[PDB]
Design a protein around this nucleic acid. Structure first.
Ligand SMILES: [Mg+2]
Ligand SMILES: [Mg+2]
Ligand SMILES: [Mg+2]
Ligand SMILES: [Mg+2]
Ligand SMILES: [Mg+2]
Ligand SMILES: [Mg+2]
Ligand SMILES: [Mg+2]
Ligand SMILES: [Mg+2]
Ligand SMILES: [Mg+2]
Ligand SMILES: [Mg+2]
Ligand SMILES: [Mg+2]
Lengths: 63, 109, 236, 128, 112, 125
RNA sequence: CCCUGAAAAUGGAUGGCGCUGGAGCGUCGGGCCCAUACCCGGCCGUCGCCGGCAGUCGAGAGUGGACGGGAGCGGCGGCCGGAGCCCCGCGGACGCUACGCCGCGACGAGUAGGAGGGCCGCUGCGGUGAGCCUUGAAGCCUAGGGCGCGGGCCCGGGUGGA
C-alpha cells in the first residue's frame, strides 16, 4: 500500500481523432509516421492538431 | 524385512488461528522434539499411504487398493520438532492423526 | 599447447593479475601487428544428353508446414548431462559399505567400488553373501556407513562403463499392430560376461572382507528400523 | 492418433469452479448466472472472509493460453464446406466444429473435406 | 519521529544497498542498475560515470549529492528478518522509532 | 487506391467473417485467409493467389496485371502447374522473387502451395 | 503483592478448561507462529513512457558521406604498376486486421455518483453470408464435452415438427 492520488493518474488528451473521416484518418497515419521517425517538432503540433475538434480547429479568416 | 521409514503423524495444515493454508501440512516426526535435530529429515521425501476401494496400478507390482500421496519435507516448524512439508496434492483432512512415513529418500549423509 | 600458466586459487579468479600474466606469457616480445562444397559435377550420362548434370546436395525442401515456431534465444549455459560436473559425497569412498534404499535390493549392505562417469555408483555386493551383482546405484539413494575396506590395488576391469550396464531393448521387429504379444525377452538373460566379471571382482574382494571379523554376516544382514532407534540419532 | 497442434503449452487456469451468484442455492428463482450484488448490508459485496468470491480481472487467463481447447487448439464455427477453406492456412492453431444446425448429409461431406485438408474437427461423429 | 528509524550507514552498508537493491530513475522508470552505461547516460555530466562513482558520491557527500540521491530510486527493502521488538516507541526507550546512532547498520543487514 | 479502399472495407465487407475471437476474409485472391491490408487480394494493384486446379491434380496461380486495373474481365492471368512439388515451389518462387511481383507473399504462396499439394495426394488409412 | 472494606435477583464466566517450583504478578533474554502488510517471482488489467515498428532494407545501411586534381605515406603486384560490379548454390522464418503488433516502468479497496469497453444478451428493419433447415429449425431436457474473470456462448445426446 503506497499513498498516492490516482485522480490525475490518467492524463486526458486526444490520442486518435474521434471522427470517422477516412481521409482524415489517412494523413493521421502519415503524420504519425512523420513525427515518430523525425526530430522535427513541427510534425508533433500538426499531428497534435489533427486530433482536435472542429471547435478546437477554428476557421482561419483570409484577412 | 525392514521398516525403512520413520513414522510421523499428520498434525494439521499450516494455519493461523482463524485462517488455514491447506497447501502445506505440519508433520510430527516421532523421536525428535527440538528444532536442531530436524536437520536430518530436513529434505527427506515423505509419503502418505492409504487404502481405497477400487484397485490401482502399482509400479513394479500388481494392481491393488493401495494408493499414496507423495511429498517432501520443507523445513522445521517451531522450536520443537514439528516439521512442515508439502505434497503434490493437498492432504485430505481425514488423514489427521494417522501414519505418515518419511522414506529416508535423498540423503545428504 | 602450453598449460594454463595461471593457477586458480578460487573458481573464476586466477592466482596472478593482468600485468603479472603479461610478463609470464612473454607478451612483451611476441607482439603481432597484422596478417565448400554445395554442388558436385556428376558426369553426363548421354549419349547426346551432353552437359554434365550439376547436381547439388541439400536439395530444396519438397514441402513447407503451414507455420513453424521461431527459434529460441541463446543461453550461454545449460550444458547437456553428458558433460555435467560429477559431484560425489565425501563419506562415499572406494571400499565403503552402502545401503540400498530404493530398489529390489533395498536395505542390502554392499561395498562401493569406483564411481561411474555418469555419476552413478558402480557397486557389487559379495553376491555369495547378499546376491547383489555388479549394478549401478545412485549416490542420493544410499547411506554411506563408516565402514571401509581397502579395495585399493584391486583391478576393476575398464570395460565397465555405463553403456555396459545400460538396459537393452528389443521391441519391435517389423510389428506395429499389437495382437501377438511377445512371450520372449521377459526372462532377462544374465550374460556370461556379467557372470565371469562378477566372479573376477568377487574373487579378489572376498579375501578383503573376510579379514575383519563378522563382516560377511554384517553384509549378509539387511538394515531395518525398530520401534526403538531413530535414524537422526544413528551414526552410520 | 489425432492431429497435433503447432505447440501444446501447459494451460494454466487461475480458477476452475464457476462463479455462482450469491444466494443461487437458497432460491430457485435466482439463477446461477453471475450478478454483482449491490446492497448496503450485502456481506459478499463487502468481501467478507469465508464467502462467495467475486469475478475480477485478476482471474484473467494467460494471453497466450486464453481460449485454448484442452488440446492445444482454438475453436472456430463453420456452417458448410465454404468457411472450412479459410482454416486451411491456420490448420494447426485453430480447430473447427460443425454447427449444431447443419444436417447430417451436409455434415458428412464436410468431415471428408476436413480430413483431406488436415483440419482438426471437434465433433466428427455428430450424426453417426 | 515515530514513522521512521534512521542512523548513520557505514561503507559496507552503503555498498550493499546500491548493489543488491540499487535502482535508477531513468525516464521516470524504475530501472535496475545492471550496467554502468545506464549511470553514464544520465549522470555522466556530473562525473558520476560508474557504479563506484555512485557509491563514492553517496558515502562521502559530494558537490552533486542531490542529483545522485534523486537519481536513485528509493530502496524497497524486505521486512526486517528477525523482528524488531517494537514499532510504536523510540529506539532510546527500547523501540525502533527515531534516531539510532549506528545500529542502523545492524537493521540494514536484517532488511536486505 | 489501395489504402483508401482498405479503410472502406477494413471492417465492412461481404467477405468478412468475424467469429469467436477470430477474423477471416474470403475474397477469392487472398492467401492465409486473414483480413489484413498486406494480404487482401482486392485492393492491391499487383496481387497473387494459389488455388487448387479445376481437376483434382495440379495447382493454379493467378496474377493481376498492371493495365486492366478497372476491368476485372481481364485483370487476372491464370495458369496451372501439374509437376512435382519441389519443381512447383521453385517454379512458384521465380514468379515472385525474380519478377519482384510483391516479394512479400513469396512464402505465403509456397506455404499455401505446399498445403494444397499435400491435400491432393491420397490419405493413408 | 495479598486480605477486610465488598450485597441481587434463570445457572456462568481471566473466552473455556484449568492454572499455584506458575498457564499469576513485576523486570528482562533467546527462539518460535502468521495478514490480502513488505521482498522476489509468475499471470491479468489500467495508466504512463503521446515509447518502438511503413527499413518485408538477404543486402539495408549515415555518430557525415560525396568528387576532383593536391603531396604523401601503410601493405600486396621487380625499382613502374591498382577494381574487385554478390554468388559452386538463384536462396534466406514470422510479421504490419497500423482501430494492428511489440517493448519497459509503476500501479490495482470502494457506498452515493460519473465515465469507458463489452466478439454480453432480446426484439424488429436496410444490407450481407451461392448462410443454416423435414437427411429435422425454433423451443425444451440433460450425472455429456468444453470456452470466456464475467455478462454469456459453442458443440454431444433426447424430444420436437418448420
Ligand atoms: Mg498495491
Ligand atoms: Mg481509488
Ligand atoms: Mg471457467
Ligand atoms: Mg435458484
Ligand atoms: Mg455500510
Ligand atoms: Mg439488511
Ligand atoms: Mg525466522
Ligand atoms: Mg497510536
Ligand atoms: Mg479484592
Ligand atoms: Mg477498483
Ligand atoms: Mg434440438
Amino acid at each position: 500500500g503506497v499513498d498516492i492520488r490516482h485522480n490525475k493518474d490518467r492524463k486526458v488528451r486526444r490520442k486518435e481523432p474521434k471522427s470517422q473521416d477516412i481521409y482524415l484518418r489517412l494523413l493521421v497515419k502519415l503524420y504519425r509516421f512523420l513525427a515518430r521517425r523525425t526530430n522535427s517538432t513541427f510534425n508533433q503540433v500538426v499531428l497534435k492538431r489533427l486530433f482536435m475538434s472542429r471547435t478546437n480547429r477554428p476557421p482561419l479568416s483570409l484577412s | 524385512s525392514g521398516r525403512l521409514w520413520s513414522k510421523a503423524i499428520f498434525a494439521g495444515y499450516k494455519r493461523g488461528l482463524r485462517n488455514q493454508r491447506e497447501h502445506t501440512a505440519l508433520l510430527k516426526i516421532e523421536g525428535v522434539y527440538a528444532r536442531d535435530e530436524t536437520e536430518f529429515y530436513l529434505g527427506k521425501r515423505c509419503a502418505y499411504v492409504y487404502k481405497a476401494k477400487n484397485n490401482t496400478v502399482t509400479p513394479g507390482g500388481k494392481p491393488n487398493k493401495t494408493r499414496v500421496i507423495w511429498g517432501k519435507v520443507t523445513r522445521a516448524h517451531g522450536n520443537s520438532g514439528m516439521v512442515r512439508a508439502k505434497f503434490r496434492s493437498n492432504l485430505p483432512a481425514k488423514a489427521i492423526g494417522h501414519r505418515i512415513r518419511v522414506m529416508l529418500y535423498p540423503s545428504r549423509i | 599447447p602450453h598449460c594454463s600458466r595461471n593457477p586458480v586459487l578460487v573458481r573464476g579468479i586466477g592466482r596472478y593479475s593482468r600485468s603479472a600474466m603479461y610478463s609470464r606469457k612473454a607478451m612483451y616480445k611476441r607482439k603481432y601487428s597484422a596478417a565448400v562444397l554445395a554442388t558436385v559435377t556428376k558426369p553426363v550420362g548421354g549419349d547426346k544428353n551432353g552437359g554434365t548434370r550439376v547436381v547439388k546436395l541439400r536439395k530444396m525442401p519438397r514441402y513447407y508446414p503451414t507455420e513453424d515456431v521461431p527459434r529460441k534465444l541463446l543461453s550461454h549455459g545449460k550444458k547437456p548431462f553428458s558433460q555435467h560436473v560429477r559431484k560425489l559425497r565425501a563419506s562415499i569412498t572406494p571400499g565403503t559399505i552402502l545401503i540400498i534404499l530404493t530398489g529390489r535390493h533395498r536395505g542390502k549392505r554392499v561395498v562401493f567400488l569406483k564411481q561411474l562417469a555418469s555419476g552413478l555408483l558402480l557397486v557389487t555386493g559379495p553376491l555369495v553373501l547378499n546376491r547383489v551383482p555388479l549394478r549401478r546405484t545412485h549416490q542420493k539413494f544410499v547411506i554411506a556407513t563408516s565402514t571401509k575396506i581397502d579395495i585399493s590395488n584391486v583391478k576393476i576391469p575398464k570395460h565397465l562403463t555405463d553403456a555396459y550396464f545400460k538396459k537393452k531393448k528389443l521391441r519391435k521387429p517389423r510389428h506395429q499392430e499389437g495382437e501377438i504379444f511377445d512371450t520372449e525377452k521377459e526372462k532377462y538373460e544374465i550374460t556370461e560376461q556379467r557372470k565371469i566379471d562378477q566372479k573376477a571382482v568377487d574373487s579378489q574382494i572376498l579375501p578383503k572382507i573376510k579379514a575383519i571379523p563378522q563382516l560377511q554376516g554384517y553384509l549378509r544382514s539387511v538394515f531395518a528400523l525398530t520401534n526403538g532407534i531413530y535414524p537422526h540419532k544413528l551414526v552410520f | 492418433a489425432a492431429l497435433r497442434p503447432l505447440v501444446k503449452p501447459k494451460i494454466v487456469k487461475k480458477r476452475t469452479k464457476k462463479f455462482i451468484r450469491h444466494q443461487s442455492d437458497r432460491y430457485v428463482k435466482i439463477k446461477r448466472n453471475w450478478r454483482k450484488p449491490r446492497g448496503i448490508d450485502n456481506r459478499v459485496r463487502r468481501r467478507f472472509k469465508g464467502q462467495i468470491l467475486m469475478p475480477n480481472i485478476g482471474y484473467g487467463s494467460n494471453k497466450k493460453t486464453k481460449h485454448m481447447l484442452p488440446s492445444g487448439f482454438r475453436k472456430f464455427l463453420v456452417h458448410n464446406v465454404k468457411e472450412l477453406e479459410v482454416l486451411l492456412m491456420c490448420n494447426k492453431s485453430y480447430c473447427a466444429e460443425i454447427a449444431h444446425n447443419v444436417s447430417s448429409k451436409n455434415r458428412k461431406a464436410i468431415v471428408e473435406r476436413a480430413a483431406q485438408l488436415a483440419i482438426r474437427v471437434t465433433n466428427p461423429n455428430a450424426r453417426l | 519521529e515515530p514513522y521512521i528509524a534512521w542512523g548513520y550507514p557505514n561503507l559496507k552498508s552503503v555498498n550493499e544497498l546500491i548493489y543488491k537493491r540499487g535502482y535508477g530513475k531513468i525516464n521516470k522508470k524504475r530501472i535496475a542498475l545492471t550496467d554502468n552505461a545506464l549511470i553514464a547516460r544520465s549522470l555522466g555530466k556530473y562525473g558520476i560515470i560508474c557504479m563506484e562513482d555512485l557509491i563514492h558520491e553517496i558515502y562521502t557527500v559530494g558537490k552533486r549529492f542531490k542529483e545522485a540521491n534523486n537519481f536513485l530510486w528509493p530502496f524497497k527493502l524486505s521486512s526486517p528478518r528477525g523482528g524488531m521488538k517494537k514499532k510504536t516507541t523510540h529506539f532510546v526507550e527500547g523501540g525502533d522509532a527515531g534516531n539510532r546512532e549506528d545500529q542502523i547498520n545492524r537493521l540494514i543487514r536484517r532488511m536486505n | 487506391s489501395a489504402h483508401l479502399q482498405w479503410m472502406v472495407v477494413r471492417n465492412c465487407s461481404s467477405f468478412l467473417i468475424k467469429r469467436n475471437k477470430q477474423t477471416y476474409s474470403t475474397e477469392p485472391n487472398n492467401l492465409k485467409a486473414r483480413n489484413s491490408f498486406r494480404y487482401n487480394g482486392l485492393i492491391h494493384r499487383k496481387t497473387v493467389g494459389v488455388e487448387p486446379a479445376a481437376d483434382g491434380k495440379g495447382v493454379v496461380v493467378v496474377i493481376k496485371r498492371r493495365s486492366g486495373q478497372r476491368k476485372p474481365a481481364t485483370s487476372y492471368v491464370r495458369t496451372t502447374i501439374n509437376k512435382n512439388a519441389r519443381a512447383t515451389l521453385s517454379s512458384i518462387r521465380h514468379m515472385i522473387r525474380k519478377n519482384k511481383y510483391r516479394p512479400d507473399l513469396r512464402m505465403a504462396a509456397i506455404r499455401r502451395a505446399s498445403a494444397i499439394l499435400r491435400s491432393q495426394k491420397p490419405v493413408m488409412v
